[PDB]
């Protein structure tokens, strides 16, 4: 079982679809700015916002990178599955199918049975994904440094720092039992 | 606060002159063959043991090695420093200076009020250390590739692969630490 990275223009195209159904789920007649789609966020829920600017915010940063095509849908990918997986935590005893975006991200990222993360492909998605985030709060994308003055995460209930810790508590979970998997193997071989 | 490292040559010097001293501390008698000091070994307590082994075939190993000379003291003055450490955790109520081989690792490293690691500088040692020993273990330093053949660091009442994890660990904590300290000091500017 291993996943296939989607495309990174394909994945914008759907993120941007799904967000678009999103906002028009909740105000059937919303003006959409086509390069603007961030002004229309403030028709989903309060919940949806941050998850959708971080997204946005995101594909902007890639879009004006000078990232290799795998590299930025390594991250953009990585993102998605992330906040899928946010979701998800957020039921506790039915399906997470019962959000539409929830169910859109599922479909972007075309998840199936045979086409899915395995323990080293999450590690390299959320690793690389930590990586782009870093590169976007510190100087040299480095703590040591200090802030950048400009901070394109600074986005309302939203905090950047919790997620590039969490992203990294999970890189460090998934290397600790792919040690441990090897051990295993390597000991009852 | 921060540590210099030591010269390797002068490191691989100092840490040889106190396990010599170790072990003619059980026995005056030693006789030593300089070129093969795994061999009097034995003569230490069964706790020295595995550190002794450990650390001259690290010593072996990047004697060997094609790394530069600031990468091989890096990785020598990790280990002797991980090593101190270990030791000091075995004291639960006076001085780890009680050990004479503690001692000499203070003394080898040079270590004093104003020479001394910060997390950043354990950071860069730790990790060192943990890519060394999985360079070590692992075909391409990758446990997802499984085993090397031959396990130049399985060596008895050791494992290398709880000092991987373990090494793993602390630098994971030291960069969460690292994270939260620019954290504090950017909003409280």
């Not at 599955?81 to 019962?98: E, F, G, L, M």
């Not at 590169?135 to 480095?142: E, G, I, Q």
């Not at 440094?145 to 979970?173: C, M, N």
């Amino acid at each position: 079982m291993s996943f296939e990275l989607v495309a990174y223009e394909k994945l914008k195209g759907s993120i941007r679809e799904s967000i678009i159904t999103l906002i028009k789920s909740h105000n059937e007649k919303a003006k959409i700015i086509e390069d603007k789609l961030e002004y229309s966020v403030k028709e989903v829920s309060r919940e949806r916002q941050p998850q959708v600017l971080v997204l946005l915010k995101t594909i902007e940063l890639l879009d004006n990178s000078s990232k290799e095509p795998e590299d930025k849908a390594r991250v953009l990918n990585a993102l998605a599955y992330y906040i899928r997986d946010q979701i998800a935590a957020t039921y506790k005893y039915t399906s997470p199918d019962n959000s539409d975006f929830y169910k859109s991200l599922t479909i972007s990222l075309d998840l199936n049975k045979d086409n899915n993360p395995n323990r080293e492909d999450l590690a390299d998605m959320y690793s690389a994904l930590e990586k782009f985030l870093r590169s976007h709060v510190y100087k040299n994308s480095d703590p040591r440094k200090g802030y950048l003055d400009k901070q394109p995460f600074a986005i309302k209930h939203y905090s950047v720092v919790d997620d590039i810790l969490e992203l990294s508590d999970r890189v460090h979970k998934l290397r600790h039992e792919i040690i441990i998997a090897a051990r295993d193997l390597h000991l009852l071989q």
